[PDB]
């Protein structure tokens, strides 16, 4: 049979005996992601350039792809009636949902990732993490500060050569490809497992001068293998979603470690590291700061950063072992 | 006003007093590229996964994007009545158009570029160069062997977050955005010039062990600038058309130099290097093998390879100076 | 808030305490209807006309819009795991669903209605009726022979100037408009109520010579009102879905009564009359053969026909009263 | 081969040795019509119903399809640099193009026709006629007053189940299907001829009480053919472009004769009757007021009305004979 994202989530909610709130949430996400894909692919851009004159906004307003993404996600999530607290990359403070629209889930998200790659048309995406509320207190920032291990669902949307949504939950990672002709996400890879060992490494080598000793040592070894085999190939798109996705599907390792300008690391823990690290773990892969598991860090700031190394298990441990050795 | 690719092409043909055969040719090229863009974004993919039943072709029974792209290009172009010789990365021999469909142009193209990036949904593209057939004798493969200096037009379509067609001719380089809701390319950026000096470097460092010393030295300055300025950032998508286009839009440098497994460079002279050098040049940048201008190479095989270094003029110039210095 | 069809059905299944089987069914229908809309609007027709040559089917096969509709519906319904018996306009015998895919619902449908209007591009649609299985016996034709009053859900999809799906269930009729850019049905009219009295009548007057006395009398009166007011306007598209939809939204009356060639009437009772008559009743309108209510006819043949008059209550009763008088 | 509207238009312009200004004009017209088609099908309608929030414009604050259509037409056409005078159903006065944008053509159009059918989702269309400006004096409204006999081109886009553009010029009538997945019109039916005699009649019979006796007699023969052949079928969509196009494709007759509330007929000479008569004539059919050819009327007001009878030659001829007979 053919499986659509919409039938998959519903069949998994039925199996789980869920009241449906989460199903409704995911169905929301799936609508938000299409809305975002269409905007990213520039449908309707002729109207910006005056195809029908300029009568159309008497108001002075037109939205950055960034702002619009954020609007779509917030409104679409709020509409699902399934969330109490949202955390966006774009808001300094957690968003507490009005009581009349309040459900039991906490969503951390990057509405659009890969922003240095927007104006040059390289791939970008959306990264999301879902938790259930613990407390019985009035929902607050506190509810979003959970460690990754606690995620109920996570994944991302990539807008590349085509659009793909990847969803991880307790029983695995599935990839669904968007068919833009009918607006339906089609299950295309089931229960995805990352290769033990890859042949690609992905890091911004422009910080070479600022890497700690173990990265430097590891990078060296990718380029001059001591066993004299073939060097890993390099790839670094510049968009976390794209490098992470290539990593899942081809294997290899992706790195964003601490440097001079970011000594805690660049990437955000709540709506960048955590979700990607959850996906990576359901698929049999690893995600470490180099010192601890990423999913085990208990955050204290919704916008806190962390270094991350993620990918194939043999490659990431190879790197961990360099760290262990150096210490 | 609003300027669609169709009106631009037509008006430029009218100004140059063309007979209309080149216009017809770029019009075809514009249609080819929309049909590839839709296949790339996976429209109607639901039919492959049995939405309307008859599941019967599954696994790898049916036609890869690469092949479909090639077909669209060959068939759309023959239909313009403007070509006599086509050379495609995907065909071992030049294609000679039937007399009843012969026009005066030669076209070299890479129907779909960045094939290592297809399965992982990274940006992919189509590259093209157009030549005016000089000889009066029977059209043939040697017709496709002109130096890049001779191009009448070259450019590319990037299938990225959004689809863009970049077209260069004697009077400059223009960027057209594809609005997929109306099937129209919209002129978005006009008479583009690349900046004098960028701060991004693009290369596959996996090959670090194979690099010549100029290349090696140059990477060093990028990471450890002797004068202690900010180090360059690295970006390498793995798709030529994506790396090149970022390089045009953002400035900086792109390299695929010679290595051991590729003593002549990996990239193809006729349908990757030439068009890209032409675009880069008409934009105010440089394209060199390290020793000579790409566009002046005298091609002897239609699938010949070359080393290619391109982008911001000061960046390429600094690298040429390292070459000269290293005898 | 904005309501999508997908969120609406799910919110109504939650309210109803349904296990979800029906929700899954409707979500299926909604996917089938998009798939159908895209095909009807001719996306991809360039491939039929050879945009990429003719390499693409080595097989001799291409589908009528009619056959393809039917494939989409059957397969999509079967996939919902929610149906046991389907009745199609296109199959002489009821379709009994395999046990491993069997649920509790019976669906009668016209995959595409308005076929004399296909080749001239006039509006066409899809008409569906859903029943719950009564028996505990092995599902058979018998399960589909229920009177209309027994419907659980009904509606239709119109593909006109835009695409609209109309859905009626116990608590009303709602219209959702398809937004083809994101593939989502958007609630656009809520709890729809037909006007008491309209000013349009819709019948094929070419059979004038074969109408019974009451129609003739009623038509006369629409054209020469005895109270000397303004005559009704005439409209007859030729597609039941379109004339029925105009009827719901503008008011008026639609007629397909018995004639020489069809003395039982043309339209099918199970997947034409019944569904339209259910919609018409939830909206406060009437549907009569002229002698009995349409929804109260207990069918004995899955393909049985019946005359129908439907529409605004004052207009349809006005017609009934002529019948009553003549008898 | 495959023939797109863009290549047809270009090739016909090349064969006729045009300067390219008319080509540019039909190219614009082709783009106008795709942009209307997408607005008509409701793409991005999700934004109007607050999907990305900011619900603030609701009810009837924002721009009706009719207005958007008009704007697209005026702006796309001025941008072609090929027009000097435009007349639109939606503008009280002719529009005179600015000198810097003046070309030599005059265009009369009905940006969106079948407005009674908009809210009910029935087929709607755009009608156009193009004239060559004869006078050397300042361009003005009288420039738009040529008889239909003078048209260089006329035709229509039908927004139906699928979108089709029908274009007629001196050398015949051609049907192009719009493939909305690539934004290309595909030549689908070439050099169309309407059949000699059809079996469908199209009229609003609601006006039966106002009809002249020729019309009245003619309807009678249609329902009660004196020679006892099969009676004609009736079809009346309520959108001129839909009724007319069915009439071209299927044969038969279309009438909007004079009535009491419309002593001169309702339909407009310049942008409904003229173009349609021209298409019908170039197809081998007839277009008459009942007494004279539509195309020979000498228009005195740009919004003048006329009675119109068109379609299969033998059908119109029979009706003219009834006119003649009734003195
Ligand atoms: N659609 C679904 N897919 C996977 N798990 C679900 C789904 N719905 C509910 N569950 C599981 O059931 C729990 C409670 O469900 P709910 O009653 O929908 O809030 C969730 O937190 C999930 O672990
Ligand atoms: N659409 C166009 N845009 C720019 N230059 C053109 C165009 N068409 C023709 N030309 C120039 O005029 C030459 C002859 O045109 P053609 O007769 O179409 O081959 C070409 O080689 C171009 O240099
Ligand atoms: N999505 C829904 N919308 C409206 N009614 C529903 C829905 N789901 C279930 N119901 C009602 O519940 C009955 C049994 O539901 P189910 O358990 O889904 O087969 C149906 O036959 C409906 O009357
Ligand atoms: N694309 C075209 N298709 C058919 N005829 C054309 C075309 N372009 C020009 N012509 C004919 O040539 C005349 C002058 O062309 P132009 O110089 O473009 O105004 C027009 O009035 C048409 O009769
Ligand atoms: O240019 P840099 O410092 O490598 O940063 C790249 C990272 O920045 C981000 O845009 C921050 O979100 C990531 O998507 C990406 O991996
Ligand atoms: O993996 P490598 O050796 O860097 O090759 C990448 C290059 O290869 C190509 O795919 C050759 O087509 C280019 O698109 C790209 O720049
Ligand atoms: O031409 P006739 O006899 O009026 O039949 C029209 C009817 O035929 C049908 O196509 C039969 O399904 C209906 O959609 C439509 O109302
Ligand atoms: O309702 P009436 O009087 O038949 O008018 C229908 C005619 O009116 C128009 O809408 C006038 O634009 C035509 O499209 C159509 O043929
Ligand atoms: Mg962001
Ligand atoms: Mg981010
Ligand atoms: Mg290629
Ligand atoms: Mg290539
Ligand atoms: Mg049917
Ligand atoms: Mg039918
Ligand atoms: Mg109009
Ligand atoms: Mg009109």
* DSSP calls for C201-217: EE--GGGGGG--HHHHH
Describe the crossing of helices A5-16 and A21-40 by its angle, rounded to 10 degrees.
160
Q: Note whether D159 and D65 are within 8 A (CB).
A: no
How many whole angstroms separate alpha carbon C286 and alpha carbon C314? Answer: 9
* Residues in the 5 Å CB sphere of ion ligand 13: C 89, 110, 112
Cβ <8 Å between A38 and C7:
no
A255 has binding-site annotation: no
Counting ligand 3 atoms within 8 A of each CB, the residue from C18, C21, C29 with the most, and so the one to mutate, is C18
CA distance between the termini of chain A: 53
H helix intervals, chain D: 5-15, 21-40, 45-48, 65-78, 213-223, 240-250, 274-282, 313-325
Q: Note whether D136 and D149 are within 8 A (CB).
A: no
Supply A20's token pair. 């449906």
Residue C191, phi then psi, degrees to nearest 5: 50, 50
- Only one residue has tokens 């793909």, namely A164
In Å, how far is D202's CA from the nearest CA of chain C?
9
Residues after which chain B is broken (C–N above 2.5 A) are none
How many whole angstroms separate alpha carbon A287 and alpha carbon B61? Answer: 37
From the list A42, A124, A159, which residue is nearest B178 (CB)? A42
Buried/exposed code over B261-273 (b: 16+ C-beta within 10 A; e: otherwise): eeeebbbbbbbbb
* Cα C226–chain centre separation: 34
- Total Cβ atoms within 10 A of residue C315: 28
Which residues sit opposite A53 in a β-bridge?
none
Which residues sit opposite D156 in a β-bridge?
D127, D166
CATH of D192-326, picked from 3.40.50.2300, 3.40.190.80, 3.40.50.300, 3.20.20.140, is 3.40.190.80
- Only one residue has tokens 């649609």, namely C125
Which residues sit opposite C182 in a β-bridge?
none
Q: Rounded to the nearest 10 degrees, how much is the dihedral formed by the CA atoms of A177, A179, A182, A183?
A: 50
- Total Cβ atoms within 10 A of residue A190: 12
Supply C321's token pair. 């009263």
Which residues sit opposite D88 in a β-bridge?
D109
Q: In what order do the strands lie in the sheet with A83-88?
A: A95-96, A83-88, A102-113, A124-132, A153-159, A163-169, A172-179, A184-189
- Total Cβ atoms within 10 A of residue A57: 10
Residues counted in chain A = 327
Supply D188's token pair. 């689908």
- C228 Ramachandran zone, left/alpha/beta (phi>0; psi -120 to 50): left
How many whole angstroms separate alpha carbon D128 and alpha carbon A216? Answer: 70
Q: In what order do the strands lie in the sheet with D286-288?
A: D233-234, D200-202, D253-256, D308-311, D286-288
Taking CA–CA distances from A73, the nearest residue in chain D reads D52
* Cα B109–chain centre separation: 8
Cα separations in angstroms, A242 against A156, A267, B238, D20: 10, 14, 12, 46
* Cα D64–chain centre separation: 20
Q: Note whether B276 and B127 are within 8 A (CB).
A: yes
Which residues have CB under 8 Å from A12's CB, separation 6+? A23, A169
Which residues sit opposite A105 in a β-bridge?
A83, A132
- Only one residue has tokens 């509606």, namely C155
How many whole angstroms separate alpha carbon D288 and alpha carbon D258? Answer: 12
Residues of chain C in contact with residue D187, where contact means CB-CB under 8 angstroms, are: 49
Supply A294's token pair. 């990423």
Cα separations in angstroms, A297 against A134, B200, D119: 17, 33, 57
Ligand 1 pocket member A150 (CB < 6 A): no
In Å, how far is A211's CA from the nearest CA of chain C?
44
Q: How was this structure determined?
A: X-ray
Residues of chain C in contact with residue A3, where contact means CB-CB under 8 angstroms, are: 79
* Sheet strands (E) in chain A: 83-88, 95-96, 102-113, 124-132, 153-159, 163-169, 172-179, 184-189, 200-202, 233-234, 253-256, 286-288, 308-311
Cα separations in angstroms, D117 against D98, D112, D158: 35, 11, 13
Query: What is the radius of gyration, based on Cα positions, of chain A?
Result: 20
State the ligand closest to the CA atom of B272.
12
Supply A46's token pair. 């002729």
How many whole angstroms separate alpha carbon B220 and alpha carbon A25? Answer: 50
Residue among D221, D218, D234, D237 at smallest CA distance from D319: D218
Which residues have CB under 8 Å from A266's CB, separation 6+? A256, A259, A305
How many whole angstroms separate alpha carbon B90 and alpha carbon D150? Answer: 52
Counting ligand 4 atoms within 8 A of each CB, the residue from D13, D134, D155 with the most, and so the one to mutate, is D13
Architecture of domain C1-191: 2-Layer Sandwich (3.30)
How many whole angstroms separate alpha carbon A247 and alpha carbon A201? Answer: 9
Which residues sit opposite C128 in a β-bridge?
C109, C155
SS3 B274: helix
Q: Note whether A75 and A109 are within 8 A (CB).
A: no
Q: Note whether D276 and D283 are within 8 A (CB).
A: no
Which residues sit opposite D186 in a β-bridge?
D4, D177
How many whole angstroms separate alpha carbon D97 and alpha carbon D102? Answer: 6
Pairing of strands A95-96, A83-88: antiparallel
Handedness of CA A276, A281, A286, A292 (dihedral sign): positive
Taking CA–CA distances from D41, the nearest residue in chain B reads B181
**Domain(s) of CATH 3.40.190.80: residues in chain B:** 192-326
How many whole angstroms separate alpha carbon D105 and alpha carbon D83? Answer: 4
Q: Note whether B102 and B140 are within 8 A (CB).
A: no
* Cα A170–chain centre separation: 17
Which residues sit opposite D129 in a β-bridge?
D108, D154
How many whole angstroms separate alpha carbon A96 and alpha carbon A54? Answer: 38
How many whole angstroms separate alpha carbon B117 and alpha carbon B40? Answer: 12
Q: How is C9-47 classified by DSSP, letter by letter?
A: HHHHHHHHT--SHHHHHHHHHHHHHHHHHHHHTTTTHHH
Give resolution in angstroms: 2.5
Q: In what order do the strands lie in the sheet with B308-311?
A: B233-234, B200-202, B253-256, B308-311, B286-288
Q: Note whether B144 and B131 are within 8 A (CB).
A: yes
Supply D183's token pair. 């934004």
Residue among C108, C140, C113 at smallest CA distance from C303: C108
- Total Cβ atoms within 10 A of residue A189: 15
Q: Note whether B161 and B277 are within 8 A (CB).
A: no
Supply A213's token pair. 């000793």
Q: Note whether B61 and B82 are within 8 A (CB).
A: no
Q: Rounded to the nearest 10 degrees, how much is the dihedral formed by the CA atoms of B216, B220, B226, B232?
A: 130
- Total Cβ atoms within 10 A of residue C71: 20
Which residues have CB under 8 Å from A126's CB, separation 6+? A32, A33, A36, A69, A73, A109, A110, A111, A112, A113, A156, A157, A241
How many whole angstroms separate alpha carbon A140 and alpha carbon A127? Answer: 21
Q: Rounded to the nearest 10 degrees, how much is the dihedral formed by the CA atoms of B22, B25, B30, B33?
A: -140
Ligand 1 pocket member A169 (CB < 6 A): yes
From the list B3, B20, B34, which residue is nearest D10 (CB)? B20
Buried/exposed code over B166-197 (b: 16+ C-beta within 10 A; e: otherwise): bbbbeeebbbbbbbbbbbbbbbbeeebebbee
Report which secondary-structure segment, H or E, holds D166.
Answer: strand D163-169
Give the single-character DSSP code of D322. H
Residues counted in chain C = 327
Cα-based angle A44, A48, A49 (whole degrees, multiple of 5): 110
Residues with CB under 6 A from ligand 3: C 9, 12-13, 16, 18-23, 26, 104, 132, 152, 169
- Only one residue has tokens 């006395």, namely C213
How many whole angstroms separate alpha carbon D320 and alpha carbon D327? Answer: 11
Query: What is the radius of gyration, based on Cα positions, of chain C?
Result: 20
Q: Note whether B174 and B160 are within 8 A (CB).
A: no
**Domain(s) of CATH 3.30.540.10: residues in chain C:** 1-191
Q: Note whether A131 and A152 are within 8 A (CB).
A: yes
D58 has binding-site annotation: no
Residue B283, phi then psi, degrees to nearest 5: -95, -5
Q: Note whether B287 and B308 are within 8 A (CB).
A: yes
- Only one residue has tokens 């033990």, namely A196
SS3 D108: strand
Task: Let me know if A60 is a catalytic residue.
Answer: yes
How many whole angstroms separate alpha carbon B259 and alpha carbon B253? Answer: 18
Give the neighbours of chain B: at least 3 Cβ pairs within 8 Å. A, C, D
Q: Note whether B312 and B291 are within 8 A (CB).
A: no
- Total Cβ atoms within 10 A of residue B150: 16
Give the single-character DSSP code of B236. B
SS3 D102: strand
Describe the crossing of helices D21-40 and D65-78 by its angle, rounded to 10 degrees.
160
Residues counted in chain D = 327
Residues counted in chain B = 327
Q: Note whether A48 and A15 are within 8 A (CB).
A: no
Burial grade of A213 (CB within 10 A; 0-12, 13-18, 19 or more): exposed
In Å, how far is A65's CA from the nearest CA of chain D?
12
Cα separations in angstroms, D122 against A297, C73, C84, C313: 59, 24, 35, 23
How many whole angstroms separate alpha carbon A90 and alpha carbon A83? Answer: 18
- Total Cβ atoms within 10 A of residue B299: 20
Q: Rounded to the nearest 10 degrees, how much is the dihedral formed by the CA atoms of C76, C78, C83, C87?
A: 80
| Nearest residue (CA) to ligand 4, atom 15 | D18
* Cα D204–chain centre separation: 18
Cα separations in angstroms, C240 against C116, C122, C288: 11, 12, 16
How many whole angstroms separate alpha carbon B28 and alpha carbon B162? Answer: 20
Distance C240 CA to ligand 7 centre (A): 6
SS3 A208: helix
Supply B253's token pair. 């440098």
How many whole angstroms separate alpha carbon C225 and alpha carbon C199? Answer: 12
How many whole angstroms separate alpha carbon B173 and alpha carbon B246? Answer: 15
Which residues sit opposite D98 in a β-bridge?
none
* Residues in the 5 Å CB sphere of ion ligand 11: B 89, 110, 112-113
- Beta-carbon-side half-sphere exposure of residue A5 (alpha carbons within 13 Å): 30
Residue among A295, A235, A304, A236 at smallest CA distance from A269: A304
Supply C113's token pair. 């209605």
Q: Note whether A84 and A250 are within 8 A (CB).
A: no
Cα separations in angstroms, A150 against A24, A131, A296, B37: 20, 7, 9, 40
- Total Cβ atoms within 10 A of residue A99: 9
- B121 Ramachandran zone, left/alpha/beta (phi>0; psi -120 to 50): left
Burial grade of C100 (CB within 10 A; 0-12, 13-18, 19 or more): exposed
Which residues sit opposite D202 in a β-bridge?
D254
Residue among B179, A44, B177, B10 at smallest CA distance from D81: B10
Report which secondary-structure segment, H or E, holds B72.
Answer: helix B65-78
- B114 Ramachandran zone, left/alpha/beta (phi>0; psi -120 to 50): left
Residue C94, phi then psi, degrees to nearest 5: -50, 140
Give the neighbours of chain C: at least 3 Cβ pairs within 8 Å. A, B, D
How many whole angstroms separate alpha carbon A251 and alpha carbon D320? Answer: 79
Cα-based angle A52, A56, A57 (whole degrees, multiple of 5): 145
Burial grade of B94 (CB within 10 A; 0-12, 13-18, 19 or more): buried
Residue among D192, D199, D293 at smallest CA distance from D248: D192
Burial grade of B11 (CB within 10 A; 0-12, 13-18, 19 or more): middle
In Å, how far is A262's CA from the nearest CA of chain B?
14
SS3 B149: helix
How many whole angstroms separate alpha carbon D89 and alpha carbon D110? Answer: 5
Give the single-character DSSP code of A304. -
SS3 A325: helix
How many whole angstroms separate alpha carbon D14 and alpha carbon D12? Answer: 5
């Amino acid at each position: 049979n053919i499986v659509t994202l919409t039938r998959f989530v519903m069949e998994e909610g039925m199996k789980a005996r869920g009241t449906g709130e989460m199903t409704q949430l995911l169905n929301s996400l799936c609508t938000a992601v299409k809305a975002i894909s269409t905007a990213v692919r520039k449908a309707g851009i002729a109207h910006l350039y005056g195809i029908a004159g300029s009568t159309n906004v008497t108001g002075d307003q037109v939205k950055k792809l960034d702002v619009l993404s954020n609007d779509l996600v917030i409104n679409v999530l709020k509409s699902s009636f399934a969330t109490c607290v949202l955390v966006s990359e774009e808001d300094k403070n957690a968003i507490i949902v009005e009581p009349e629209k309040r459900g039991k889930y906490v969503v951390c998200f990057d509405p659009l990732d890969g922003s240095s790659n927007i104006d040059c048309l390289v791939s970008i995406g959306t990264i999301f993490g879902i938790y259930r509320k613990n407390s019985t207190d009035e929902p607050s920032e506190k509810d979003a500060l959970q460690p990754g291990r606690n995620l109920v669902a996570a994944g991302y949307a990539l807008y590349g050569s085509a659009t793909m949504l990847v969803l991880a939950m307790v029983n695995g990672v599935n990839c669904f490809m968007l068919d833009p002709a009918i607006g339906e996400f089609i299950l295309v890879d089931r229960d995805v497992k990352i290769k033990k060992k890859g042949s690609i490494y992905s890091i911004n080598e422009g910080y070479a001068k600022e890497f700690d000793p173990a990265i430097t040592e590891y990078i060296q070894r990718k380029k001059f293998p001591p066993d004299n085999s073939a060097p890993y190939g390099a790839r670094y798109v510049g968009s976390m979603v794209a490098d992470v996705h290539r990593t899942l599907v081809y294997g290899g390792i992706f790195m964003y470690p601490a440097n001079k300008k970011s000594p805690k690391g660049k990437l955000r823990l709540l709506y960048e590291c955590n979700p990607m690290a959850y996906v990576m773990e359901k698929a049999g892969g690893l995600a470490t700061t180099g010192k601890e598991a990423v999913l085990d860090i208990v955050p204290t700031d919704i916008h806190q950063r962390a270094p991350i190394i993620l990918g194939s298990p043999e490659d990431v441990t190879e790197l961990l072992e360099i760290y262990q050795k150096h210490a």
